[PDB]
Amino acid sequence: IKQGIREVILCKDQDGKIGLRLKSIDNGIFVQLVQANSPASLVGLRFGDQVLQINGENCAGWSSDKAHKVLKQAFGEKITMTIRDRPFERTITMHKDSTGHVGFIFKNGKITSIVKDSSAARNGLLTEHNICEINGQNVIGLKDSQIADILSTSGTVVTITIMPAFIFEHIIKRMAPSIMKSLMDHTIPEV
């Protein structure tokens, strides 16, 4: 989680798409969805990012509908955004034990218990938190087994980016659970 504000310069693709859906939360605007192979994924926009400005206009108090509208009406060639990095999320670093375990249970991407004497216990992992990212990779809407799989095939060091479930549940309302599975960028960023 970078500790403040960065500028990103965005270029609509051939189809006039940027690959972003936005959600109004507590009078801010937040990234609900980033599409794979979009301008938004290429410049590195992430689920949970806050949009402060769009072309130097403040987003404070905008509806989801109005932010989508501004984005369409932009003059294509160059959209500037001011971004605050994943403000609702935190990152925890854990170490697998010799049995390949970090030490938690989860259900639908939500952590539901912390196992005694684990790395998750030692690092203060919390329940009622949704897994957003594993080792920088967005895992939102993947089945539980694919998350377990990504955890299996991680090295012994495991970074997990989590979000309070009440906030998570507020951001994803009105995005069908199959779009999450199907259309949220789950790839490792390109260099």
- CB neighbour list of residue 101: distance below 8 Å, 6 or more residues apart: 115, 118, 119
Experimental method: X-ray
Give which of 25, 2, 10, 6 is closest to 168, Cα–Cα: 25
Say if residues 38 and 71 touch (Cβ distance below 8 Å). Answer: no
Q: Domains (ranges, CATH) in the chain?
A: 5-84 (2.30.42.10), 90-183 (2.30.42.10)
Side-chain-facing half-sphere of 27: CA atoms under 13 Å: 3
Say if residues 59 and 53 touch (Cβ distance below 8 Å). Answer: yes
- C-alpha dihedral over 62, 68, 70, 73, to 10 degrees? -160
Binding residues: 108, 143-144
Per the structure block, which two tokens stand in for 90? 């935190």
Gap between the Cα atoms of 53 and 99, Å rounded: 47
Say if residues 42 and 190 touch (Cβ distance below 8 Å). Answer: yes
Gap between the Cα atoms of 13 and 170, Å rounded: 29
Per the structure block, which two tokens stand in for 37? 């192979």
Give which of 141, 37, 42, 126 is closest to 89, Cα–Cα: 126
Nearest-5° Cα angle at 116, 114 to 117: 120
Side-chain-facing half-sphere of 18: CA atoms under 13 Å: 31
The resolution in Å comes to 1.9
